[PDB]
Structure formats: C-alpha cells, structure tokens
Amino acid sequence: APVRLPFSGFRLQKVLRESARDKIIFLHGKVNEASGDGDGEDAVVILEKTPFQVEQVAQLLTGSPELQLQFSNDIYSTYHLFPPRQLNDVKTTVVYPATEKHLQKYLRQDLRLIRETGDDYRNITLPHLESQSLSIQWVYNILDKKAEADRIVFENPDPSDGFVLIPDLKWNQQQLDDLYLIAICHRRGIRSLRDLTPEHLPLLRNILHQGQEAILQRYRMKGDHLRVYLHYLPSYYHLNVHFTALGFEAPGSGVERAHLLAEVIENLECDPRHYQQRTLTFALRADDPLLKLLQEAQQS
Amino acid sequence: VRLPFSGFRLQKVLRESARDKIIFLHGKVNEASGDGDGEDAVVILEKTPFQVEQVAQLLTGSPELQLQFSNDIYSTYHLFPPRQLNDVKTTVVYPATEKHLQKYLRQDLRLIRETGDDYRNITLPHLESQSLSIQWVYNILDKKAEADRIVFENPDPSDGFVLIPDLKWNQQQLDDLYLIAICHRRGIRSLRDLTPEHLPLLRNILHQGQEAILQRYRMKGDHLRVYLHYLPSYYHLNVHFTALGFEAPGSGVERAHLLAEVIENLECDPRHYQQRTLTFALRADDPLLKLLQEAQQ
Numbered sequence: 001a002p003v004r005l006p007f008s009g010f011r012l013q014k015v016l017r018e019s020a021r022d023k024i025i026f027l028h029g030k031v032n033e034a035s036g037d038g039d040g041e042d043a044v045v046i047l048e049k050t051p052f053q054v055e056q057v058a059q060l061l062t063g064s065p066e067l068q069l070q071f072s073n074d075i076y077s078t079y080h081l082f083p084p085r086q087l088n089d090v091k092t093t094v095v096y097p098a099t100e101k102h103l104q105k106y107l108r109q110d111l112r113l114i115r116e117t118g119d120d121y122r123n124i125t126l127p128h129l130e131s132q133s134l135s136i137q138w139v140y141n142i143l144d145k146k147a148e149a150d151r152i153v154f155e156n157p158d159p160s161d162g163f164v165l166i167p168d169l170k171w172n173q174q175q176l177d178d179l180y181l182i183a184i185c186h187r188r189g190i191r192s193l194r195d196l197t198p199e200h201l202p203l204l205r206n207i208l209h210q211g212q213e214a215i216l217q218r219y220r221m222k223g224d225h226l227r228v229y230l231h232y233l234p235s236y237y238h239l240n241v242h243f244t245a246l247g248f249e250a251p252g253s254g255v256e257r258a259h260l261l262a263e264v265i266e267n268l269e270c271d272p273r274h275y276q277q278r279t280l281t282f283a284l285r286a287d288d289p290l291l292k293l294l295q296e297a298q299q300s
Numbered sequence: 301v302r303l304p305f306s307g308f309r310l311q312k313v314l315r316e317s318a319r320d321k322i323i324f325l326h327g328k329v330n331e332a333s334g335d336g337d338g339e340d341a342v343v344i345l346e347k348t349p350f351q352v353e354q355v356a357q358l359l360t361g362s363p364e365l366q367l368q369f370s371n372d373i374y375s376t377y378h379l380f381p382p383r384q385l386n387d388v389k390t391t392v393v394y395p396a397t398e399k400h401l402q403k404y405l406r407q408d409l410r411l412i413r414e415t416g417d418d419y420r421n422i423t424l425p426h427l428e429s430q431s432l433s434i435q436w437v438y439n440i441l442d443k444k445a446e447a448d449r450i451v452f453e454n455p456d457p458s459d460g461f462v463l464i465p466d467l468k469w470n471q472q473q474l475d476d477l478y479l480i481a482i483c484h485r486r487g488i489r490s491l492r493d494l495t496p497e498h499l500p501l502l503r504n505i506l507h508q509g510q511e512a513i514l515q516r517y518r519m520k521g522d523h524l525r526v527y528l529h530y531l532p533s534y535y536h537l538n539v540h541f542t543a544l545g546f547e548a549p550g551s552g553v554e555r556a557h558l559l560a561e562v563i564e565n566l567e568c569d570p571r572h573y574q575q576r577t578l579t580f581a582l583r584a585d586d587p588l589l590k591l592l593q594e595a596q597q
C-alpha cells in the first residue's frame with residue numbers, strides 16, 4: 001500500500017547539491033509550517049534516478065515506445081523515450097528532521113585535502129569530534145533490533161567480535177549491479193579507523209570473511225566481485241564497513257576517503273599502532289573550521 | 301516518433317554503469333519482420349538529470365510513494381513520477397557494424413590480491429613476455445612528440461620528469477584538470493619497482509609538480525589528488541594529478557595509490573612494495589587473471 005512523506009508540505013529552500021553524472025539532486029525544504037509556531041522544520045529530500053533493469057528495457061524496445069526524435073543522421077539517432085511506470089522508479093531518501101550538520105554535509109562541496117598526522121588527530125581532530133559527527137541512533141536501532149530487523153542479511157551476535165550486515169540506505173535493492181551493504185560492529189565505542197588496534201583483528205576478520213560469505217550465499221556474488229572498505233573520515237563515528245559491487249563505481253570509493261578492509265587488517269598485522277601513528281589523508285569542505293584548525297597546527 | 305526498426309531481441313549487454321545510470325545494448329532487430337533475418341542494432345539508454353522546478357512542484361503535491369524502509373530520522377522510498385520527469389535519452393545505432401559492437405563492449409572486472417611472491421613468480425614473468433608499447437613515453441621524454449604541450453620539466457635523468465596534460469583533458473576548464481608526470485629514468489615499471497633510492501625522484505614529482513600547477517593554473521596543491529595506478533596501463537612510472545573535485549575514472553581505492561603515502565611507506569618500510577600484497581582489478585578476459593587465480597588455488 002502507498003505511503004506519504006513523513007511531513008506535510010515541502011517548500012524548497014535550497015538545492016544543496018545536484019549532479020548530472022549520477023542524476024541525483026539533494027533538496028533542503030521547510031516542512032510542517034502550518035503547525036505550532038509556524039516556522040516549520042527542516043527536511044532533506046534526495047532523489048536519484050535508478051539503474052536500468054535490462055530485461056524490462058529489452059521488453060520495452062520490442063514494442064512501440066512513446067518517443068520524440070531529437071537527432072537523426074544516417075545510422076545514428078537520439079530520442080527522448082517516455083517509459084511505462086515500472087521503468088520510472090526514482091529512489092527517494094528523506095532525512096527529517098534534518099539538523100544543521102546534515103545541511104552542511106550535503107551542501108555544494110568546495111573541498112580541500114588535508115594530511116592528518118597522528119598528533120593532529122590526538123590534539124586537534126579528536127577534541128573537535130562532536131562537530132564532525134552525526135547521531136548514530138540509527139546504528140543502535142539496528143543493533144538493538146528496533147529498526148531494519150527484517151532486513152538483516154547476516155548477523156554474528158558476538159558482543160565483541162560480532163556485527164550486523166544489512167542493505168545500505170543508498171541501495172534500492174532492485175538489482176545486483178549497484179549491490180551495496182553496510183556492516184556495523186556490535187561493539188560500541190570504535191569511532192573510526194583511528195581506534196583500531198590488534199585487539200580488533202578478530203572483529204575485522206569476521207566482518208570481511210563472514211560478510212563476503214553471507215553475500216555469496218544470499219546474492220551468489222563472489223568475493224572477487226566486491227570492493228570492501230571503510231571511510232576516513234566517516235560521517236557516523238561507529239565503525240562501519242561498506243561492501244560494494246566492484247562493477248559499480250560507488251560514490252565515496254575514491255582513494256582520498258576509502259580504505260580496503262583486507263589492507264587495514266594486514267596493516268594491523270604488520271604494524272600494531274599503524275592507525276594511531278601514521279598520517280591519514282582526507283578531504284574537508286573549504287569553510288570547515290576543522291580544516292582551519294588543522295592547517296593552523298601545520299605551521300604554528 | 302518510431303524506432304528505425306521493429307522488434308528487439310537482446311543479445312548482449314555491451315556495457316553498463318549503475319553509477320551513471322546508462323546501459324549499452326546489442327540487439328537483433330527485424331527478426332519477426334521482412335525475412336526472419338535479424339539485423340544488428342546498438343541502443344544506449346541513459347537516465348536524465350532532475351530539473352529543480354519539476355521536483356519542487358512534485359514534492360509540494362505530496363506524491364506517489366512505496367516505502368523501502370525507515371530508521372529514526374531516515375527513510376527511503378520508490379517514487380513513480382509523472383511523465384515529465386521520466387525522460388530517457390535513447391541513442392540508436394542501426395544497422396550496427398561489428399566495429400560498433402567492439403567500440404562499446406566492456407569486460408566485467410575481478411579483484412585479485414597479488415602477494416609479493418605472486419608478483420615475482422607470476423606477474424613479472426608475464427609482463428616480460430609482452431606489454432603495451434611505451435614508445436609514446438620515450439618520444440615525449442626526448443621531445444620528438446608533444447614538446448609544444450609540456451607544462452613543466454625537470455631534466456635530471458635520474459630524479460627528473462616531464463609534466464604534460466593527459467590526452468583526455470580538453471584543457472578548457474580547471475574542473476576536470478588532469479595532468480601526468482613521466483619520470484626520465486628508464487625501467488621503473490610501476491609501484492612494484494619502488495625503493496628508498498627512488499625517494500628523491502618521487503618527492504620531486506610531488507613537490508615540483510604541484511609548484512608547476514600552481515604557477516601555471518593558479519591551483520593550489522590542496523586542490524590536487526596525486527597518485528599512481530596499480531596496475532598501470534603503461535609500464536613506465538607515471539603519476540596522475542587531478543582536480544580533487546573531479547571524481548576521475550581510475551581514482552578508486554582498487555586502483556589509486558596516493559604519492560605522498562607511497563613516499564611515507566618507503567620512509568617507514570623500505571621494502572614495502574616488494575613484500576606487501578597489493579589489490580587491483582583485472583578484466584575477466586585478461587590472461588594474467590587466470591594465471592594469478594591458478595597460482596592462488
């Protein structure tokens with residue numbers, strides 16, 4: 001049965017980000033303005049065109065589609081095609097209420113690289129962690145079985161080395177070409193790559209190997225078809241591991257943010273304090289006060 | 301108004317990108333008309349970008365949604381919009397030749413984790429017995445070709461390099477800035493050949509390359525993603541310099557290795573790149589792939 005948006009009204013305030021490459025748009029709206037004090041609340045709505053399902057397209061092309069001709073020369077032609085309902089799914093994500101930090105995170109990237117030494121992290125980034133971080137209530141809801149419980153693909157229930165593997169928020173689950181799952185560990189308080197020590201080795205291994213094996217069983221997708229990594233910086237500071245189809249150029253899979261789990265494990269095995277001592281490189285928005293702070297300590 | 305053929309039997313997905321929302325299909329057409337004799341067609345379909353005004357108006361109307369899930373402040377849905385937002389850009393090549401098929405065909409990729417032993421025992425012998433020609437590189441290094449495109453050169457034959465635009469950058473804007481640095485010293489095949497003896501050369505590429513980009517384009521270094529491919533397509537050490545804001549093809553974690561970190565790894569771990577396992581993707585029809593998989597079973 002069809003539902004509604006979880007608020008009334010949407011009045012556009014700002015296009016936060018738009019891209020013709022992946023055909024996505026991120027909108028900041030005011031919602032629920034006819035109640036209470038009348039100022040309404042902030043919501044983010046993300047709309048993304050979906051990947052094609054090849055069998056449905058071939059079936060369309062076999063018939064008489066609704067078309068307009070845009071270009072035509074000799075053996076080459078371009079049309080505008082207007083498919084029937086089934087091919088028209090738009091993937092819609094809603095963040096509501098959206099905080100100021102959400103609004104900042106999605107906004108128009110003017111990004112800059114920074115190389116963060118271990119000491120920068122300990123002295124500058126860690127103390128200012130709160131401002132970088134979004135609520136992880138959603139993570140607790142999965143781990144506590146209060147949301148997404150029927151989406152769990154695999155769970156190792158061990159309170160220290162265990163994890164839950166679920167389809168990622170970004171994936172609409174309708175085809176395997178952009179397969180994307182997230183694994184969140186049961187153990188609390190591992191903020192990021194920086195907290196990782198050899199004590200986490202059994203946890204990391206179970207994520208990598210039991211995650212791959214669960215994906216093989218559920219989706220028939222082999223491990224050499226997967227690109228499995230974490231982000232630094234993450235947006236949610238509870239360790240989370242992304243399992244993506246290798247054939248999908250996943251957004252956020254760039255060398256300036258993604259770190260392969262197999263390699264994180266081998267670094268820990270070669271070098272116990274690798275993630276507390278070494279320098280990690282990532283991108284921050286140009287006006288991010290953390291950037292300013294990090295730049296300042298990099299001469300002063 | 302009509303497709304230039306009738307009927308479509310799918311033959312192969314030649315290529316697709318679930319990130320770019322495009323697919324390239326080889327079909328047989330006219331199989332159930334004229335003769336029975338099917339002709340070849342390529343049809344490329346691409347989703348269209350959103351227009352702000354159409355989306356804002358759809359959303360104020362409280363629209364047509366099917367819940368995927370919700371958790372806390374987060375929820376996701378399938379939305380089936382009115383016709384105006386559903387446009388698919390459809391490109392037809394008809395009749396298609398075998399040369400068109402070849403142009404779009406792309407092999408699927410498979411991941412491989414190459415040990416230090418794997419490289420010594422399998423990969424390097426395979427490389428010794430044939431690779432893509434690096435004549436174009438030699439020709440640049442000694443100015444027979446592309447001397448009119450040089451952005452910067454350090455002539456030192458051990459520790460120097462030429463910095464030049466990459467062929468795929470049309471140079472008309474900074475948004476997609478793409479340059480390549482090629483070292484003067486011969487016989488550094490890739491990352492696997494790197495030792496602390498290369499540190500002067502790596503540091504030069506990083507530091508003088510950023511300088512050059514700064515004087516040439518006014519682009520500061522913290523705007524730059526600077527890295528090597530592994531595997532490279534050409535086996536003569538080359539470093540890529542792209543605008544950070546450009547999500548460049550080949551800058552993914554499964555291929556790209558930041559130059560600054562490669563330098564720091566050498567400082568910390570002299571033999572890193574001969575001993576440690578490196579991870580890359582190969583085309584499913586690459587002879588090296590079956591070689592490595594056989595070795596590893």
Ligand SMILES: C[n+]1cn([C@@H]2O[C@H](COP(=O)(O)OP(=O)(O)OP(=O)(O)OC[C@H]3O[C@@H](n4cnc5c(=O)[nH]c(N)nc54)[C@H](O)[C@@H]3O)[C@@H](O)[C@H]2O)c2nc(N)[nH]c(=O)c21
Pocket residue numbers: 022024046048093138148166167168169170182230231233234235236237240242251252371374
């Ligand atoms: C709230 N929530 C989040 N996820 C998942 O948790 C991970 C946290 O990663 P993370 O902390 O490493 O960093 P992110 O910046 O979040 O990575 P991310 O947002 O992936 O950033 C990478 C890039 O993708 C871009 N992006 C964000 N959404 C989309 C999208 O829907 N489509 C496309 N094409 N790009 C998107 C974004 O601009 C950024 O450059 C992410 O994978 C979330 O989807 C959730 N998964 C489930 N099942 N349930 C939830 O309630 C939930």
Ligand SMILES: C[n+]1cn([C@@H]2O[C@H](COP(=O)(O)OP(=O)(O)OP(=O)(O)OC[C@H]3O[C@@H](n4cnc5c(=O)[nH]c(N)nc54)[C@H](O)[C@@H]3O)[C@@H](O)[C@H]2O)c2nc(N)[nH]c(=O)c21
Pocket residue numbers: 405406407436446464465466467468480528529531532533534535538550583
């Ligand atoms: C010949 N040439 C190349 N470049 C640049 O040097 C860098 C080498 O990087 P690299 O050695 O790290 O390898 P790639 O980035 O994979 O390179 P790439 O050239 O993309 O190598 C791949 C090629 O093989 C082809 N290819 C890629 N995938 C497939 C596939 O799946 N199937 C088939 N059949 N072909 C494929 C593809 O068309 C492409 O031409 C790159 O940035 C090049 O653009 C050149 N630059 C200048 N200034 N002058 C030149 O003459 C010149």
Ligand SMILES: [Y+3]
Pocket residue numbers: 037039
């Ligand atoms: Y108020």
Ligand SMILES: [Y+3]
Pocket residue numbers: 037038039
């Ligand atoms: Y008021």
Ligand SMILES: [Y+3]
Pocket residue numbers: 055
């Ligand atoms: Y089927």
